[PDB]
Write an enzyme that holds these catalytic residues in place. Structure first.
Site, mmCIF file in Angstrom:
data_model
loop_
_atom_site.group_PDB
_atom_site.id
_atom_site.type_symbol
_atom_site.label_atom_id
_atom_site.label_comp_id
_atom_site.label_asym_id
_atom_site.label_seq_id
_atom_site.Cartn_x
_atom_site.Cartn_y
_atom_site.Cartn_z
ATOM 1 N N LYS A 115 8.092 15.259 -0.055
ATOM 2 C CA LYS A 115 7.555 14.811 -0.879
ATOM 3 C C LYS A 115 7.197 15.067 -2.184
ATOM 4 O O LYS A 115 7.252 16.568 -2.159
ATOM 5 C CB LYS A 115 6.132 13.929 0.004
ATOM 6 C CG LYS A 115 5.205 13.769 -1.425
ATOM 7 C CD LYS A 115 3.960 12.859 -0.608
ATOM 8 C CE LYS A 115 2.897 12.308 -1.718
ATOM 9 N NZ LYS A 115 2.110 11.335 -1.002
ATOM 10 N N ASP A 243 -8.769 9.086 0.040
ATOM 11 C CA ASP A 243 -7.957 8.371 -0.008
ATOM 12 C C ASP A 243 -6.006 8.238 1.005
ATOM 13 O O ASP A 243 -5.296 8.165 0.558
ATOM 14 C CB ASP A 243 -6.803 8.578 -1.315
ATOM 15 C CG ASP A 243 -7.560 8.301 -2.346
ATOM 16 O OD1 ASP A 243 -8.799 7.408 -2.030
ATOM 17 O OD2 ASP A 243 -7.715 9.075 -4.037
HETATM 18 N N1 LIG Z 1 4.650 11.811 7.182
HETATM 19 C C1 LIG Z 1 5.016 10.860 7.003
HETATM 20 N N2 LIG Z 1 5.626 10.818 8.200
HETATM 21 C C2 LIG Z 1 6.710 9.442 8.111
HETATM 22 N N3 LIG Z 1 5.727 8.532 6.823
HETATM 23 C C3 LIG Z 1 5.458 9.271 6.024
HETATM 24 C C4 LIG Z 1 4.429 10.297 6.405
HETATM 25 N N4 LIG Z 1 3.901 10.089 4.406
HETATM 26 C C5 LIG Z 1 4.132 9.136 3.704
HETATM 27 N N5 LIG Z 1 5.447 8.632 4.966
HETATM 28 C C6 LIG Z 1 5.320 7.143 4.216
HETATM 29 O O1 LIG Z 1 5.081 7.302 2.876
HETATM 30 C C7 LIG Z 1 3.938 6.096 2.972
HETATM 31 C C8 LIG Z 1 2.407 6.228 2.219
HETATM 32 O O2 LIG Z 1 2.801 7.375 1.649
HETATM 33 P P1 LIG Z 1 1.803 8.561 0.463
HETATM 34 O O3 LIG Z 1 0.614 7.948 0.358
HETATM 35 O O4 LIG Z 1 1.710 9.773 1.861
HETATM 36 O O5 LIG Z 1 2.364 8.674 -0.496
HETATM 37 P P2 LIG Z 1 2.392 8.001 -2.346
HETATM 38 O O6 LIG Z 1 2.979 8.010 -3.076
HETATM 39 O O7 LIG Z 1 0.894 9.371 -2.824
HETATM 40 O O8 LIG Z 1 1.140 7.536 -2.103
HETATM 41 P P3 LIG Z 1 -0.343 5.783 -2.339
HETATM 42 O O9 LIG Z 1 0.694 5.548 -3.001
HETATM 43 O O10 LIG Z 1 -0.621 5.863 -0.950
HETATM 44 O O11 LIG Z 1 -1.114 7.686 -2.863
HETATM 45 C C9 LIG Z 1 3.290 6.133 4.233
HETATM 46 O O12 LIG Z 1 2.778 4.292 4.709
HETATM 47 C C10 LIG Z 1 4.708 6.106 5.377
HETATM 48 O O13 LIG Z 1 5.036 4.722 5.443
HETATM 49 CA CA LIG Z 2 -1.963 6.994 0.699
HETATM 50 CA CA LIG Z 3 -1.561 10.137 -3.441
#
Ligand SMILES: Nc1ncnc2c1ncn2[C@@H]1O[C@H](COP(=O)(O)OP(=O)(O)OP(=O)(O)O)[C@@H](O)[C@H]1O
Ligand SMILES: [Ca+2]
Ligand SMILES: [Ca+2]
Ligand SMILES: Nc1ncnc2c1ncn2[C@@H]1O[C@H](COP(=O)(O)OP(=O)(O)OP(=O)(O)O)[C@@H](O)[C@H]1O
Ligand SMILES: [Ca+2]
Ligand SMILES: [Ca+2]
Lengths: 307, 307
Positions: A115, A243
């Site tokens: 990520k 969050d």
């Molecule tokens: N360790 C992981 N294993 C599997 N899927 C994951 C993992 N981390 C993230 N995901 C996928 O991404 C989604 C949410 O990611 P995350 O919230 O970490 O990213 P973000 O872009 O920061 O999202 P948000 O907008 O909620 O902050 C989860 O619902 C999942 O489907």
């Molecule tokens: Ca989240």
């Molecule tokens: Ca986030």
């Protein structure tokens, strides 16, 4: 293709970064180790200890090398298994369900997730490392991300910063229901768009409706979870983090996860992980992250898992 | 008797300090825990949750309670065993062989040593705690002090600060030779005064003479030591610490220490610990504590222990 040039630099840099560390003799982690950032340069032309490449010139910043050597080891991630999975098989993008501009990739073998992360987030991960180590060595049944490495690719004056961590839901076990959970309710419904995917990531309100009887757990299995969630949340609020979701997968039947029983009676095995834990507030009240945490477990350990 | 009033306050305070913690439910250590100092007040008159006493009015500062709960546990020191040994049997003074004005006591059962410490030293111990935890959880065959607690007694405006730690050489095994070692030579001869004691603490030059053939170790036993000393010294110099000795006891024969063989051939069991580790330099050169360390092990692992 901005991306093929990113995938490239990553596979390139890690290989150099991690391969070069494997020749240096292993030793214990010191507090000093967590603040180290080593950088290594990649011309397209090529260098003394550096190859040339299709993609544009970049530097490869690798964060806290020794600590992550230790974390990988401690997570049972053999070095050339890490290397092969990540650096020797095409990286695979992912239509990010994240509202945040962060974008994900997975390994071909789908064991690792990469990520991207806000500069703020990466610098905060850097500070988490002591607390991380401490929690890791006290609660080895902890639900937090398993961080395998933190790296930065810089090309053309721009920063892309990444966190290699563990896929909680691998291609391996097919999965019938997924949930991203928080204990909050507002806009916690899967966007109609998300909702029509193959297996969509259902959010909170989706859960309280489609599984109102919940997910049932043996007396013994339920305490373990309840115990270590309490433990992780105390860690989390300690660092004034918010969050963050409990990601939950369910497989119904007809072997490494949690065994549970359906409302109807189906025997099923659940898969959980706590995610999105780098947003710290170290505009929020003093008591606020504490609130988010109590709510968090008081939801998972009363509505989402029942005894 | 300035002392009877010190012994008293100590036995009093720990009891309150540690007893009160045992009713509060156990939980993991967080980075936040290391910087905590709790104080509790002791009138001779008496208080709501405080008794009265022969000695004068004082406060009892106890440093980083939760972390030491964890360290004690991790060292196998049951709480009411700690409490009984220390707080329920007369404390016993000790003609300090330390040139420093620090003064020692032992427990009646002679399992614990209390040493007083410079304000500088105590504040530094406070900062060691993360690195301590980290080393403890990576090298459980480590030779550093086993710190059971850090406390301060303040009476009549004056600070007495103490470190409860482990007696490396208990009344139990009788002991034929002792050595305080460093790898330095100047004035490393036991003062003629010390030299006429029962079993005197011989220093370096004493050793190179009275045991010139050394202390011999099995191939297997020697590597273990050589390994973890290297490990501890890397910890020690990391923190820019100096002036620390390897305390060594030898028992010759006719069961928890290190087995070794004499020059003549006698089967004997050795007992070692690294001590005086709170003098940090965080007027010395950058490279200096590194020098002290290499010399340190290059002496123990070549002149003091041989394969
Ligand atoms: N360790 C992981 N294993 C599997 N899927 C994951 C993992 N981390 C993230 N995901 C996928 O991404 C989604 C949410 O990611 P995350 O919230 O970490 O990213 P973000 O872009 O920061 O999202 P948000 O907008 O909620 O902050 C989860 O619902 C999942 O489907
Ligand atoms: Ca989240
Ligand atoms: Ca986030
Ligand atoms: N953990 C321990 N176990 C057994 N004996 C100890 C321990 N710590 C100290 N001693 C006794 O005290 C002596 C040295 O104590 P230490 O050097 O820690 O105190 P000090 O007053 O700071 O002395 P110095 O003047 O060398 O700094 C040792 O040689 C030993 O005989
Ligand atoms: Ca000394
Ligand atoms: Ca000293």
């Amino acid at each position: 293709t901005t991306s093929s040039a990113l995938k490239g630099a990553i596979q390139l840099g890690i290989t150099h970064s991690v391969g070069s560390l494997s020749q240096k003799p292993e030793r214990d982690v010191l507090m000093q180790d967590f603040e180290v950032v080593e950088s290594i340069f990649f011309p397209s032309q090529g260098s003394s200890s550096t190859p040339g490449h299709h993609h544009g010139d970049f530097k490869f910043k690798t964060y806290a090398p020794i600590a992550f050597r230790y974390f990988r080891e401690m997570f049972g991630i053999r070095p050339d298994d890490y290397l092969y999975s990540l650096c020797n098989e095409p990286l695979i993008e992912l239509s990010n369900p994240g509202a945040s501009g962060s974008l994900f990739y997975v390994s071909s073998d789908d064991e690792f997730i990469i990520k991207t992360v806000q500069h703020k987030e990466a610098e905060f991960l850097q500070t988490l490392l002591p607390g991380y180590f401490m929690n890791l060595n006290q609660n080895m049944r902890t639900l937090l991300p398993k961080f395998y490495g933190l790296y930065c690719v810089q090309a053309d004056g721009k920063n892309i910063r990444i966190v290699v961590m563990n896929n909680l839901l691998p291609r391996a076990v097919p999965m019938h229901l997924k949930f991203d959970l928080k204990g909050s309710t507002y806009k916690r419904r899967a966007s109609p768009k998300e909702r029509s995917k193959g297996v969509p990531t259902y959010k909170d309100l989706d859960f309280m409706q489609d599984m109102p009887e919940g997910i049932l757990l043996e007396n013994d299995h339920y305490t373990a979870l309840s115990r270590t969630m309490q433990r992780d949340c105390r860690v989390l609020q300690s660092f004034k983090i918010m969050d963050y979701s409990l990601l939950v997968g369910i497989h119904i039947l007809h072997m490494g996860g949690i065994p549970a029983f359906n409302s109807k009676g189906e025997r099923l095995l659940v898969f959980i992980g706590i995610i999105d834990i780098l947003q710290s507030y170290r505009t929020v009240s003093v008591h606020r992250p504490s609130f988010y945490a109590d709510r968090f477990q008081k939801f998972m350990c009363s509505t989402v898992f029942r005894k």
